[PDB]
Every structure is written in C-alpha cells, then in structure tokens.
Design a binder for this molecule. Structure first.
Ligand code: HEM
Length: 394
C-alpha cells in the first residue's frame, strides 16, 4: 500500500486507485518535485472537472513538446524535427486530422467487425476446449493488431508479418530496429501502391488527397509517421481494456447476470469498462502560459500530467460508487479517449472490439475464473495493460 504519488510500474499497476483518491481529495493540482531531479518538476491533475477542461484547452495545454513528464522526450525518441499527429497543436494538427479522419467512419468499423468476431470465436473456443489458458497471448494481444492493420489498409495476407513488427514495437514502446525498418519499408511500398490502387482506408485517403504527391518527401514521411502512431496507439491500449476488464467482470457475477439476461445492455457495459480500465491512465501536456486552477498556479513551461484514470474515477462526477462496476451506469464524459482536438480516432474501433469480446466471453465461456493477484502488468507509466491474465474455463 502507498497513497503517495509516483509514476506507476508493473509492480504498482494492480491498485493505483487509493493514490488517485488521495490526490483528488487532498491535492487536486499536485506539484511533483523528484528529489533526485528537482529540475524535472511537473504537475498532476486528478479531478474530472480539471482534466476535462485541460484536455479541451489545447491553447493553454500544448501537446507539441511531448506527452510524458520527461523534458527530454522528443530528442530521446528522435521526433523533435517533425513530431507525430498526437504531438501537434492546431492549426498544424487540424488539416492532417481532417484528411486521416476520412478513414475513420462507420464504414471502416463495420467492415472489420465480422473478421474480429470470427477471430474472437476461434480463440475463445480453443481456450474453452483446453479449460482455459493464456487469453492475453492468444486473443487480447493479436486481436487489436489485426484491427490496426485494417485501418492502415494492410492486405489480410500480410497481417501475420505485420503482427511480428507490431509486437516488437509495442514491447519497445512500453529499440525495435528490425521492426521499424521492416515496417517503414513495407509502407513505402504500400503508399506507392495506393497512388494507383486506392481503397477506403486512412493511408489510401492521405495518398488520394495528395499528401506526398509531386516529390513531397515530407508529406510521405508524415504518412509513415502516422503508421507508427497507429501501431503505438491502437494495440497496448485495447489489450489493456480487454485484459483489465477480466477481473472486474469476474468478481461481479450480478453484473455478468444482467448481461447474460439482456445482451442488449452490452454497449453500455463497454462504456463502464472503458471508464474503469482507462488503459491510457495519463498523458502529459506543456503549459504555454501561467494558469491558475483553484489555489495553485502552474507556471508556463512545465509538464502537466492529465490523470484520465483518476478523472474517470472521480466521485464528484460519478458519485460515491465511482470505484464500483455498474454496467447500467451509462457514464458520460468519460476521459478514456481524452476530449477535444486529439479525441481518440480509434474510439469506435476500440468500442467494437470490447463489445464483440464481451458478447462472446459471456456466450461461449460464461463459467470462468480469473486470479487477479496473479495478473502480470506491463511496465511503463502511461498505459495500464496486462501481459498475462490467468484464465480458467469450466
Ligand atoms: C481502448 C483502447 C484505446 C484507448 C484507451 C485510446 C486512448 C487514446 C487517447 C487518450 C488519445 C489522446 C492522446 C492524448 O490525450 O494526447 C488517443 C489518440 C489516438 N488514438 Fe486511441 N485509444 C485506444 C484505441 C485506439 C485504436 C484502436 C486506434 C486505431 C484504430 C487508435 C488511434 C488513435 C490515434 C491515431 C490517436 C491520435 C489522435 C490525434 O492526436 O488527433 N486508438 N487514443
């Protein structure tokens, strides 16, 4: 047990909630001054109201210096020259987002759903036949990779090779030189193909809109950067949502009962699971001006950690039962996908995967066991996701 603020590790991901509660109740605008590195001080926002408003306010809370509390981030990763879309502010962010958004419509979520369902069924049946097993390795890891592949217009025949690169990158993001090289090489070819054979995906749309046309190397690089953004955005997060939901469901048979009796309640249940798992538990911003929130003034030029995971658990927004699973809650203004300019492009895709996985878990493996104490969590301070979830089926 610890109620003192610290960036999470594999060992402290099981139960960050009391720490968050202490912040919300006693220091909602919390100044962190690392004793070993006081020059790397930063601030932490834990309440729903403050996080909601800060996420929206890109003018005051910029994404352009990076999304971690590490002040050397952009040079450390090698993206200072031209940061990716998630590290762009408007207006730079706006045009590119408009173009790629053409590949994030109901059509793209709908076309991949039968493929998602088929894979979920295949893997859950294998688990059922074997009385359980490694649900993360066999389902919750590979599934989101296929969906990201779909959104990038990777042909189905290349999904296995694409999974290989994805896993190396995801593990490293939590070097991957072979993977980064293979992927950037593969997409160079695919982008070229989309010049003459455009489909309905985000890459096809970027190419059709003339990004990279007429020797615009920088444009082409932006498409390549977007592929890396997608791999890092759409994988560990979904695995976190899926794996993180398992103990929550297991320990509430009454809540499973509600959905067994009314499967049409599953979409609402997905929102509640997204609220409580909040796979992106926090991301940072940089203040562009001094800003006062209550009795605290955050100086210009400092990182501010937006604790989405805490905002999602704030009793001021969701009541004294905010810590509990209620699949009929219908929570509004969840922070799981942030809010404002950078609102997750993959929200509908993530929701669809959760819906299909939950539907089939209840239909195919209703009697299951999860030992929460034996879950292994990934390292990394921003995304909360299991590497392994003990899973037994009777
Ligand atoms: C449950 C799973 C997911 C969670 C919790 C999640 C969370 C988020 C969050 C919090 C942001 C905003 C980042 C910020 O505040 O700076 C974001 C952005 C983004 N996400 Fe997701 N995401 C998920 C799944 C996905 C999927 C499946 C995809 C792709 C199909 C995706 C693609 C993106 C992209 C491209 C952005 C950048 C948007 C922009 O900066 O304008 N995400 N996501």
């Amino acid at each position: 047990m610890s109620h003192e603020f610290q960036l999470a590790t594999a060992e402290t991901w099981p139960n960050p909630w009391p720490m968050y509660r202490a912040l919300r109740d006693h220091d909602p605008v919390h100044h962190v001054v690392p004793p070993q590195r006081p020059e790397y001080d930063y601030y932490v926002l834990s309440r729903h109201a403050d996080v909601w408003s800060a996420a929206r306010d890109h003018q005051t809370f910029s994404s352009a210096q990076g999304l971690t509390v590490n002040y050397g981030e952009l040079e450390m990763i090698g993206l200072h020259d031209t940061p990716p879309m998630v590290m762009q502010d408007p207006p730079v962010h706006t045009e590119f987002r408009k173009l790629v958004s053409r590949g994030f419509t109901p059509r793209q979520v709908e076309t991949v759903e039968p493929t998602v369902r088929k894979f979920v069924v295949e893997r859950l049946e294998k688990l059922r036949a074997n009385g359980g097993g490694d649900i993360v390795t066999e389902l919750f890891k590979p599934l989101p990779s296929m969906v990201v592949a779909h959104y990038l217009g990777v042909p189905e025949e290349d999904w296995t090779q694409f999974d290989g690169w994805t896993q190396a990158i995801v593990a490293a993001n939590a070097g991957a030189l072979d993977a980064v090289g293979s992927m950037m090489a593969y997409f160079t070819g695919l982008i070229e193909r989309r010049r003459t054979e455009p489909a309905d995906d985000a890459i096809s749309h970027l190419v059709a809109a003339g990004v990279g046309a007429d020797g615009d190397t920088a444009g082409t690089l932006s498409i390549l950067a977007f592929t890396f953004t997608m791999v890092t955005a759409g994988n560990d997060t979904v695995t976190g949502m899926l794996g993180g939901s398992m103990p929550l469901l297991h320990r509430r048979p009454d809540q499973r009962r509600l959905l067994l009796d009314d499967p049409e309640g599953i979409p609402d249940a997905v929102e509640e699971l997204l609220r409580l798992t909040s796979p992106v538990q926090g991301l940072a911003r940089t203040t562009t001006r001094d800003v006062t929130i209550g009795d605290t003034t955050i100086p210009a030029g400092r990182r501010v950690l937006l604790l989405y995971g805490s905002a999602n658990r704030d009793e001021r927004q969701y009541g004294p039962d905010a810590a509990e699973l209620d699949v009929t809650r219908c929570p509004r203004n969840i922070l799981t996908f942030s809010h404002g300019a950078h609102h997750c492009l993959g929200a509908a895709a993530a929701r669809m995967q959760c819906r299909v996985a939950l539907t089939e878990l209840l239909a195919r493996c209703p009697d299951f066991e999860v030992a929460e104490s034996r879950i292994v969590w990934s390292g990394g301070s921003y995304v909360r996701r299991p590497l392994s979830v003990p899973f037994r089926v009777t």
